[PDB]
Structure 1
Protein backbone atom coordinates (compact mmCIF):
# COMPACT_ATOMS: atom_id res chain seq x y z
CA UNK A 1 0.00 0.00 0.00
CA UNK A 2 1.08 3.57 -0.67
CA UNK A 3 0.60 9.73 -1.25
CA UNK A 4 0.99 11.16 -4.77
CA UNK A 5 3.08 8.17 -5.87
CA UNK A 6 -0.02 6.17 -6.80
CA UNK A 7 0.64 4.43 -10.14
CA UNK A 8 -2.32 6.09 -11.88
CA UNK A 9 -2.09 9.56 -10.31
CA UNK A 10 -2.15 11.43 -13.63
CA UNK A 11 -5.35 9.68 -14.72
CA UNK A 12 -7.04 10.30 -11.35
CA UNK A 13 -6.06 13.99 -11.33
CA UNK A 14 -7.38 14.37 -14.89
CA UNK A 15 -10.77 12.85 -13.95
CA UNK A 16 -13.87 15.09 -13.92
CA UNK A 17 -14.97 16.03 -10.40
CA UNK A 18 -18.21 14.03 -10.60
CA UNK A 19 -16.22 10.87 -11.39
CA UNK A 20 -13.67 11.63 -8.65
CA UNK A 21 -16.60 11.63 -6.23
CA UNK A 22 -17.79 8.21 -7.43
CA UNK A 23 -14.22 7.00 -6.83
CA UNK A 24 -14.43 8.52 -3.34
CA UNK A 25 -17.59 6.50 -2.77
CA UNK A 26 -15.64 3.41 -3.78
CA UNK A 27 -12.98 4.25 -1.18
CA UNK A 28 -15.74 4.35 1.44
CA UNK A 29 -17.06 0.99 0.21
CA UNK A 30 -13.53 -0.45 0.34
CA UNK A 31 -13.39 0.47 4.03
CA UNK A 32 -16.60 -1.53 4.53
CA UNK A 33 -15.16 -4.51 2.65
CA UNK A 34 -12.08 -4.32 4.88
CA UNK A 35 -14.22 -4.44 8.03
CA UNK A 36 -15.79 -7.66 6.76
CA UNK A 37 -12.31 -9.06 6.05
CA UNK A 38 -11.42 -8.21 9.66
CA UNK A 39 -14.32 -10.29 10.92
CA UNK A 40 -13.32 -13.15 8.60
CA UNK A 41 -9.81 -13.14 10.04
CA UNK A 42 -11.21 -13.36 13.57
CA UNK A 43 -13.14 -16.46 12.47
CA UNK A 44 -9.94 -18.01 11.08
CA UNK A 45 -8.18 -17.29 14.38
CA UNK A 46 -10.88 -19.22 16.19
CA UNK A 47 -10.47 -22.03 13.67
CA UNK A 48 -6.73 -22.26 14.45
CA UNK A 49 -7.59 -22.38 18.17
CA UNK A 50 -10.19 -25.10 17.52
CA UNK A 51 -7.69 -27.14 15.49
CA UNK A 52 -4.96 -27.04 18.14
CA UNK A 53 -6.76 -29.97 19.77
CA UNK A 54 -6.85 -31.84 16.46
CA UNK A 55 -3.10 -31.35 15.83
CA UNK A 56 -2.17 -32.06 19.46
CA UNK A 57 -1.92 -35.84 19.11
CA UNK A 58 0.49 -35.89 16.16
CA UNK A 59 2.58 -33.19 17.82
CA UNK A 60 2.86 -35.00 21.17
CA UNK A 61 3.76 -38.23 19.38
CA UNK A 62 6.50 -36.36 17.53
CA UNK A 63 7.81 -35.04 20.86
CA UNK A 64 7.83 -38.58 22.27
CA UNK A 65 9.68 -40.04 19.26
CA UNK A 66 12.24 -37.24 19.46
CA UNK A 67 12.76 -37.63 23.21
CA UNK A 68 13.06 -41.42 22.89
CA UNK A 69 10.15 -42.01 25.27
CA UNK A 70 8.36 -44.21 22.71
CA UNK A 71 9.74 -46.48 19.94
CA UNK A 72 8.61 -46.62 16.29
CA UNK A 73 5.96 -49.10 15.17
CA UNK A 74 6.44 -51.24 12.06
CA UNK A 75 3.98 -49.05 10.18
CA UNK A 76 6.21 -46.07 10.91
CA UNK A 77 9.39 -47.98 10.02
CA UNK A 78 7.88 -48.90 6.66
CA UNK A 79 7.36 -45.19 5.95
CA UNK A 80 10.31 -44.19 3.71
CA UNK A 81 12.81 -41.87 5.39
CA UNK A 82 12.95 -39.83 2.18
CA UNK A 83 10.54 -39.93 -0.74
CA UNK A 84 11.78 -40.10 -4.30
CA UNK A 85 14.41 -42.82 -3.91
CA UNK A 86 15.13 -45.71 -6.25
CA UNK A 87 14.64 -48.99 -4.38
CA UNK A 88 18.30 -49.90 -4.05
CA UNK A 89 18.88 -46.32 -2.90
CA UNK A 90 16.50 -46.53 0.04
CA UNK A 91 17.98 -49.88 1.03
CA UNK A 92 21.59 -48.62 0.86
CA UNK A 93 20.63 -45.57 2.88
CA UNK A 94 19.11 -47.85 5.53
CA UNK A 95 22.38 -49.82 5.42
CA UNK A 96 24.87 -46.91 5.46
CA UNK A 97 25.14 -46.83 9.26
CA UNK A 98 24.45 -49.56 11.81
CA UNK A 99 22.13 -48.98 14.75
CA UNK A 100 23.67 -47.51 17.91
CA UNK A 101 21.76 -48.12 21.16
CA UNK A 102 23.76 -45.43 22.97
CA UNK A 103 21.80 -42.94 20.84
CA UNK A 104 18.57 -41.83 22.42
CA UNK A 105 15.89 -40.09 20.45
CA UNK A 106 16.73 -37.78 17.60
CA UNK A 107 19.62 -35.58 18.70
CA UNK A 108 19.43 -31.97 17.52
CA UNK A 109 15.99 -32.27 15.91
CA UNK A 110 14.65 -28.77 16.55
CA UNK A 111 18.08 -27.14 16.11
CA UNK A 112 18.37 -28.70 12.64
CA UNK A 113 14.77 -27.87 11.75
CA UNK A 114 15.23 -24.24 12.79
CA UNK A 115 18.57 -23.78 11.03
CA UNK A 116 17.27 -25.35 7.80
CA UNK A 117 14.60 -22.62 7.43
CA UNK A 118 16.32 -19.75 5.64
CA UNK A 119 14.73 -16.92 7.62
CA UNK A 120 15.38 -18.50 11.01
CA UNK A 121 18.83 -19.59 9.84
CA UNK A 122 19.68 -15.91 9.44
CA UNK A 123 19.12 -15.38 13.18
CA UNK A 124 21.23 -18.30 14.46
CA UNK A 125 24.87 -17.48 15.21
CA UNK A 126 27.63 -19.98 15.85
CA UNK A 127 27.45 -19.36 19.61
CA UNK A 128 23.71 -20.18 19.65
CA UNK A 129 24.15 -23.70 18.22
CA UNK A 130 25.16 -25.62 21.39
CA UNK A 131 22.40 -23.86 23.34
CA UNK A 132 19.74 -24.86 20.82
CA UNK A 133 21.01 -28.45 21.01
CA UNK A 134 19.23 -28.67 24.40
CA UNK A 135 15.87 -27.84 22.79
CA UNK A 136 13.44 -30.71 23.41
CA UNK A 137 10.24 -29.21 21.90
CA UNK A 138 8.78 -26.08 20.28
CA UNK A 139 5.08 -25.37 20.80
CA UNK A 140 2.52 -22.75 19.82
CA UNK A 141 -0.94 -21.77 21.06
CA UNK A 142 -3.34 -18.96 20.15
CA UNK A 143 -5.69 -16.87 22.24
CA UNK A 144 -8.68 -14.67 21.62
CA UNK A 145 -8.56 -12.42 24.63
CA UNK A 146 -6.11 -11.11 24.59
CA UNK A 147 -5.87 -11.77 20.84
CA UNK A 148 -2.63 -13.26 19.56
CA UNK A 149 -0.41 -16.27 20.07
CA UNK A 150 2.67 -17.58 21.81
CA UNK A 151 5.66 -19.74 20.91
CA UNK A 152 7.32 -21.73 23.67
CA UNK A 153 10.77 -23.32 23.51
CA UNK A 154 11.27 -26.19 25.97
CA UNK A 155 14.88 -26.66 27.07
CA UNK A 156 16.44 -29.61 28.84
CA UNK A 157 18.65 -28.88 31.83
CA UNK A 158 21.69 -27.12 30.40
CA UNK A 159 24.75 -25.06 31.42
CA UNK A 160 23.61 -21.89 29.60
CA UNK A 161 20.46 -20.84 31.48
CA UNK A 162 18.09 -22.07 34.16
CA UNK A 163 14.78 -21.50 32.34
CA UNK A 164 12.89 -24.62 31.34
CA UNK A 165 10.66 -22.73 28.88
CA UNK A 166 11.43 -19.56 26.95
CA UNK A 167 8.23 -17.86 25.80
CA UNK A 168 7.54 -15.34 23.03
CA UNK A 169 4.06 -13.78 22.99
CA UNK A 170 2.49 -11.64 20.25
CA UNK A 171 -0.53 -9.39 20.78
CA UNK A 172 -2.38 -8.83 17.50
CA UNK A 173 -5.04 -6.42 16.30
CA UNK A 174 -7.65 -7.98 14.02
CA UNK A 175 -9.55 -4.85 13.49
CA UNK A 176 -8.74 -2.41 10.69
CA UNK A 177 -5.99 -0.11 11.83
CA UNK A 178 -7.37 3.36 12.39
CA UNK A 179 -4.10 5.00 11.49
CA UNK A 180 -4.40 3.47 8.05
CA UNK A 181 -7.74 1.74 7.41
CA UNK A 182 -7.31 0.81 3.73
CA UNK A 183 -3.85 -0.73 4.39
CA UNK A 184 -5.40 -3.73 6.19
CA UNK A 185 -4.16 -7.12 4.99
CA UNK A 186 -4.86 -9.25 8.05
CA UNK A 187 -3.91 -9.32 11.73
CA UNK A 188 -1.17 -6.84 12.61
CA UNK A 189 1.15 -6.98 15.61
CA UNK A 190 0.47 -4.62 18.49
CA UNK A 191 3.05 -5.86 20.96
CA UNK A 192 5.80 -8.45 21.26
CA UNK A 193 6.70 -9.72 24.75
CA UNK A 194 9.67 -11.97 25.50
CA UNK A 195 11.03 -13.76 28.56
CA UNK A 196 13.87 -12.98 30.94
CA UNK A 197 16.65 -15.49 30.32
CA UNK A 198 18.37 -16.46 33.57
CA UNK A 199 21.87 -16.89 32.21
CA UNK A 200 24.59 -18.77 34.02
CA UNK A 201 27.79 -16.81 34.58
CA UNK A 202 29.66 -15.92 31.40
CA UNK A 203 27.03 -17.38 29.07
CA UNK A 204 24.96 -14.41 27.93
CA UNK A 205 25.74 -14.44 24.21
CA UNK A 206 23.28 -11.58 23.57
CA UNK A 207 25.35 -8.94 25.40
CA UNK A 208 28.82 -7.48 24.92
CA UNK A 209 30.77 -4.55 26.35
CA UNK A 210 32.62 -1.90 24.37
CA UNK A 211 34.91 0.94 25.47
CA UNK A 212 33.26 4.86 28.95
CA UNK A 213 32.25 1.18 28.93
CA UNK A 214 28.75 0.51 27.63
CA UNK A 215 26.80 -2.73 27.30
CA UNK A 216 25.41 -3.30 23.80
CA UNK A 217 23.39 -5.89 21.93
CA UNK A 218 25.32 -8.80 20.45
CA UNK A 219 23.94 -10.87 17.60
CA UNK A 220 22.06 -13.91 18.87
CA UNK A 221 18.91 -15.85 18.09
CA UNK A 222 18.05 -15.31 21.76
CA UNK A 223 17.37 -11.62 21.14
CA UNK A 224 14.06 -13.14 19.99
CA UNK A 225 13.15 -12.98 23.69
CA UNK A 226 14.08 -9.28 24.05
CA UNK A 227 11.78 -7.97 21.31
CA UNK A 228 11.76 -4.33 20.19
CA UNK A 229 9.46 -1.97 22.04
CA UNK A 230 6.50 -0.35 20.21
CA UNK A 231 5.42 3.30 20.16
CA UNK A 232 3.65 2.29 23.27
CA UNK A 233 6.99 2.43 24.97
CA UNK A 234 9.61 3.09 22.29
CA UNK A 235 15.08 5.81 15.54
CA UNK A 236 11.25 5.39 15.51
CA UNK A 237 10.71 3.32 12.37
CA UNK A 238 13.77 1.17 13.07
CA UNK A 239 12.25 -0.58 16.08
CA UNK A 240 9.18 -0.67 13.84
CA UNK A 241 10.87 -2.52 11.00
CA UNK A 242 12.67 -4.61 13.61
CA UNK A 243 9.26 -5.44 15.08
CA UNK A 244 7.98 -6.60 11.69
CA UNK A 245 11.07 -8.77 11.22
CA UNK A 246 10.50 -10.27 14.67
CA UNK A 247 6.82 -10.91 13.89
CA UNK A 248 7.69 -12.44 10.50
CA UNK A 249 10.04 -14.83 12.27
CA UNK A 250 7.28 -15.61 14.77
CA UNK A 251 4.93 -16.42 11.89
CA UNK A 252 7.48 -18.64 10.16
CA UNK A 253 7.96 -20.68 13.35
CA UNK A 254 4.24 -20.91 14.17
CA UNK A 255 2.82 -21.42 10.65
CA UNK A 256 5.60 -23.30 8.84
CA UNK A 257 8.28 -24.91 11.01
CA UNK A 258 6.21 -26.34 13.89
CA UNK A 259 3.61 -28.05 11.60
CA UNK A 260 6.28 -29.34 9.18
CA UNK A 261 9.31 -29.81 11.43
CA UNK A 262 10.61 -33.14 10.09
CA UNK A 263 10.63 -31.82 6.51
CA UNK A 264 13.04 -29.14 7.72
CA UNK A 265 15.07 -31.74 9.63
CA UNK A 266 15.54 -33.71 6.41
CA UNK A 267 15.76 -30.61 4.24
CA UNK A 268 12.96 -31.77 1.94
CA UNK A 269 11.40 -28.28 1.99
CA UNK A 270 13.61 -25.81 0.16
CA UNK A 271 13.39 -22.31 -1.27
CA UNK A 272 15.01 -20.90 -4.38
CA UNK A 273 14.18 -17.29 -3.47
Structure 2
Protein backbone atom coordinates (compact mmCIF):
# COMPACT_ATOMS: atom_id res chain seq x y z
CA UNK A 1 0.00 0.00 0.00
CA UNK A 2 1.02 3.59 -0.63
CA UNK A 3 1.18 5.98 2.34
CA UNK A 4 -2.02 7.72 1.25
CA UNK A 5 -3.76 4.33 1.27
CA UNK A 6 -2.22 3.51 4.69
CA UNK A 7 -3.86 6.73 5.95
CA UNK A 8 -7.25 5.62 4.60
CA UNK A 9 -6.78 2.22 6.28
CA UNK A 10 -5.87 4.02 9.52
CA UNK A 11 -9.16 5.99 9.39
CA UNK A 12 -11.16 2.82 8.68
CA UNK A 13 -9.57 1.07 11.69
CA UNK A 14 -10.60 4.04 13.85
CA UNK A 15 -14.19 3.92 12.54
CA UNK A 16 -14.39 0.13 12.98
CA UNK A 17 -13.32 0.42 16.62
CA UNK A 18 -16.04 3.06 16.97
CA UNK A 19 -18.55 0.60 15.47
CA UNK A 20 -17.50 -2.00 18.08
CA UNK A 21 -17.92 0.57 20.86
CA UNK A 22 -21.55 1.09 19.81
CA UNK A 23 -22.23 -2.60 19.10
CA UNK A 24 -21.01 -3.30 22.65
CA UNK A 25 -23.49 -0.81 24.07
CA UNK A 26 -26.19 -2.41 21.90
CA UNK A 27 -25.46 -5.96 23.15
CA UNK A 28 -25.38 -4.66 26.74
CA UNK A 29 -28.69 -2.79 26.36
CA UNK A 30 -30.13 -5.88 24.62
CA UNK A 31 -29.01 -8.10 27.52
CA UNK A 32 -30.72 -5.64 29.90
CA UNK A 33 -33.94 -5.76 27.86
CA UNK A 34 -34.07 -9.58 27.74
CA UNK A 35 -33.33 -9.90 31.49
CA UNK A 36 -35.96 -7.25 32.37
CA UNK A 37 -38.64 -9.18 30.47
CA UNK A 38 -37.53 -12.60 31.78
CA UNK A 39 -38.27 -11.28 35.30
CA UNK A 40 -41.58 -9.83 34.08
CA UNK A 41 -42.53 -13.27 32.65
CA UNK A 42 -41.58 -15.03 35.92
CA UNK A 43 -44.76 -14.24 37.93
CA UNK A 44 -47.00 -15.20 34.97
CA UNK A 45 -45.34 -18.63 34.85
CA UNK A 46 -45.73 -18.87 38.64
CA UNK A 47 -49.43 -18.01 38.47
CA UNK A 48 -50.01 -20.57 35.71
CA UNK A 49 -48.24 -23.29 37.72
CA UNK A 50 -50.21 -22.33 40.86
CA UNK A 51 -53.52 -22.59 38.96
CA UNK A 52 -52.56 -25.92 37.34
CA UNK A 53 -51.10 -27.68 40.37
CA UNK A 54 -52.43 -25.99 43.53
CA UNK A 55 -51.95 -34.66 44.18
CA UNK A 56 -50.37 -37.88 42.87
CA UNK A 57 -50.96 -36.74 39.26
CA UNK A 58 -49.56 -33.87 37.17
CA UNK A 59 -51.43 -30.55 36.89
CA UNK A 60 -54.43 -31.96 38.83
CA UNK A 61 -56.49 -28.78 38.28
CA UNK A 62 -56.27 -29.37 34.51
CA UNK A 63 -55.32 -33.01 33.70
CA UNK A 64 -52.72 -33.76 30.99
CA UNK A 65 -52.05 -30.04 30.39
CA UNK A 66 -48.38 -30.22 29.38
CA UNK A 67 -48.69 -33.48 27.44
CA UNK A 68 -51.38 -31.93 25.20
CA UNK A 69 -49.40 -28.69 24.83
CA UNK A 70 -46.29 -30.70 23.83
CA UNK A 71 -48.37 -32.97 21.56
CA UNK A 72 -49.84 -29.97 19.71
CA UNK A 73 -46.39 -28.70 18.74
CA UNK A 74 -45.04 -30.15 15.47
CA UNK A 75 -41.34 -30.22 16.37
CA UNK A 76 -41.87 -31.74 19.84
CA UNK A 77 -44.65 -34.19 18.87
CA UNK A 78 -42.08 -35.98 16.64
CA UNK A 79 -40.15 -37.15 19.72
CA UNK A 80 -43.13 -38.14 21.90
CA UNK A 81 -44.29 -41.77 21.84
CA UNK A 82 -47.39 -43.57 23.18
CA UNK A 83 -45.50 -45.00 26.17
CA UNK A 84 -44.06 -41.54 26.95
CA UNK A 85 -47.59 -40.14 27.48
CA UNK A 86 -48.25 -42.20 30.63
CA UNK A 87 -45.18 -40.53 32.15
CA UNK A 88 -45.87 -37.03 30.81
CA UNK A 89 -49.29 -36.90 32.51
CA UNK A 90 -47.30 -36.50 35.79
CA UNK A 91 -45.69 -33.29 34.53
CA UNK A 92 -46.53 -30.34 36.82
CA UNK A 93 -44.40 -27.60 35.24
CA UNK A 94 -41.78 -26.80 32.61
CA UNK A 95 -39.36 -23.95 33.41
CA UNK A 96 -36.44 -22.11 31.80
CA UNK A 97 -33.63 -20.18 33.54
CA UNK A 98 -30.36 -18.59 32.40
CA UNK A 99 -26.83 -20.59 27.95
CA UNK A 100 -29.89 -21.93 29.77
CA UNK A 101 -31.42 -24.73 31.88
CA UNK A 102 -34.75 -26.40 31.10
CA UNK A 103 -36.48 -27.86 34.19
CA UNK A 104 -39.26 -30.44 34.03
CA UNK A 105 -41.14 -30.80 37.31
CA UNK A 106 -42.92 -34.10 37.94
CA UNK A 107 -45.54 -35.08 40.48
CA UNK A 108 -44.75 -38.28 42.40
CA UNK A 109 -44.99 -41.08 39.84
CA UNK A 110 -44.35 -44.84 39.49
CA UNK A 111 -41.68 -44.42 36.73
CA UNK A 112 -38.86 -42.53 38.47
CA UNK A 113 -38.08 -40.86 41.80
CA UNK A 114 -36.86 -37.51 40.44
CA UNK A 115 -39.10 -34.58 41.23
CA UNK A 116 -37.12 -32.48 38.73
CA UNK A 117 -35.45 -33.42 35.44
CA UNK A 118 -33.11 -30.69 34.18
CA UNK A 119 -31.35 -30.14 30.87
CA UNK A 120 -28.56 -27.54 30.62
CA UNK A 121 -27.25 -26.00 27.42
CA UNK A 122 -23.91 -24.21 27.61
CA UNK A 123 -23.07 -21.89 24.70
CA UNK A 124 -21.76 -29.28 25.86
CA UNK A 125 -25.05 -30.35 27.51
CA UNK A 126 -25.85 -31.51 31.05
CA UNK A 127 -28.88 -33.66 31.85
CA UNK A 128 -30.24 -35.17 35.05
CA UNK A 129 -29.97 -38.96 35.03
CA UNK A 130 -33.44 -40.45 35.40
CA UNK A 131 -33.71 -42.71 38.43
CA UNK A 132 -36.02 -45.28 36.81
CA UNK A 133 -37.88 -47.67 39.12
CA UNK A 134 -37.66 -51.44 38.61
CA UNK A 135 -39.21 -52.64 35.32
CA UNK A 136 -40.28 -49.02 34.68
CA UNK A 137 -37.45 -47.96 32.36
CA UNK A 138 -39.44 -47.36 29.15
CA UNK A 139 -36.24 -46.76 27.12
CA UNK A 140 -36.74 -48.35 21.92
CA UNK A 141 -37.32 -44.69 21.06
CA UNK A 142 -38.44 -42.22 23.72
CA UNK A 143 -38.79 -38.55 24.54
CA UNK A 144 -36.78 -39.26 27.69
CA UNK A 145 -33.60 -39.94 25.69
CA UNK A 146 -33.60 -36.11 25.64
CA UNK A 147 -32.15 -36.40 29.16
CA UNK A 148 -28.59 -37.32 28.16
CA UNK A 149 -25.39 -35.31 28.64
CA UNK A 150 -23.22 -34.82 25.53
CA UNK A 151 -24.13 -33.46 15.51
CA UNK A 152 -27.42 -35.08 14.39
CA UNK A 153 -28.09 -36.11 18.01
CA UNK A 154 -27.01 -32.68 19.29
CA UNK A 155 -29.06 -30.68 16.74
CA UNK A 156 -32.52 -32.31 16.87
CA UNK A 157 -31.99 -32.33 20.63
CA UNK A 158 -31.23 -28.59 20.59
CA UNK A 159 -34.18 -27.85 18.29
CA UNK A 160 -36.65 -29.55 20.64
CA UNK A 161 -35.07 -27.65 23.55
CA UNK A 162 -35.37 -24.35 21.69
CA UNK A 163 -39.01 -25.09 20.90
CA UNK A 164 -39.75 -25.86 24.55
CA UNK A 165 -37.87 -22.72 25.68
CA UNK A 166 -39.21 -20.33 22.99
CA UNK A 167 -42.64 -21.74 22.10
CA UNK A 168 -44.04 -24.20 24.67
CA UNK A 169 -43.16 -22.25 27.84
CA UNK A 170 -44.22 -18.80 26.49
CA UNK A 171 -47.41 -20.04 24.76
CA UNK A 172 -48.35 -23.19 26.75
CA UNK A 173 -52.15 -22.87 26.91
CA UNK A 174 -52.48 -21.90 23.23
CA UNK A 175 -50.76 -25.16 22.27
CA UNK A 176 -53.05 -26.92 24.80
CA UNK A 177 -56.08 -25.37 23.05
CA UNK A 178 -54.53 -26.26 19.67
CA UNK A 179 -54.62 -22.73 18.22
CA UNK A 180 -50.96 -22.78 17.09
TM-score by length of 1: 0.54
1 CA distance for matches of 2:81 and 2:91?
16
Matches within 5 A, 1:55-204: 55-67=41-53, 69=54, 104-142=60-98, 148-172=99-123, 191-204=124-137
Structure 1 position 192, deviation (Å): 1.4
Shift, 1:160, TM fit: 0.2
State the distance in 2 between where 1:141 and 1:253 align.
12
Map of 2:6 onto structure 1: none
Q: 1:248/1:45 Cα in 2 relative to 1: closer, same or farther (>3 Å)?
A: farther
TM-score (norm 2): 0.80
Deviation at 1:124, TM superposition (A): 0.4
Secondary structure, in 3 states, of the residue corresponding to 1:61? helix
Find the structure with the greater CA-based Rg.
Answer: 1
**C-alpha contact (below 8 Å) 1:111/1:132 kept by paired residues:** yes
Structure with the higher helix share, 1 or 2: 2
d(CA) in 1 for partners of 2:147 and 2:33?
27
Match of 1:205 in 2: 138
Q: CA RMSD in A?
A: 2.6
Which of residues 257, 262, 273 is equivalent to 2:168?
A: 257
Provide the residue aligned with 2:40 in structure 1.
Answer: 54
Q: 1:129 to 1:49 in 2, by over 3 A?
A: same
Change (3 A) 1:42 1:123: farther
Matches of 2:141 and 2:27 in 1, distance apart? 35
Distance in 2 between the 1:105 and 1:60 partners?
15
CA distance in 2, matches of 1:241, 1:156: 32
1:1-16 equivalences under 5 Å are: none
Write the distance in 2 (CA, Å) between the matches of 1:170 and 1:41: 21
Distance in 2, Cα, partners of 1:39 & 1:241: 36
Q: Distance in 2 between matches of 1:245 and 1:152?
A: 18
Q: CA deviation at 1:44?
A: 3.7
Instruction: Figure out how many residues of one structure are paired with residues of the other and give that number.
Output: 162
What are the ranges of 5 or more consecutive residues in structure 1 without an aligned counterpart?
A: 1-24, 70-102, 143-147, 173-190, 207-217, 230-239
Shift of 1:41: 5.5
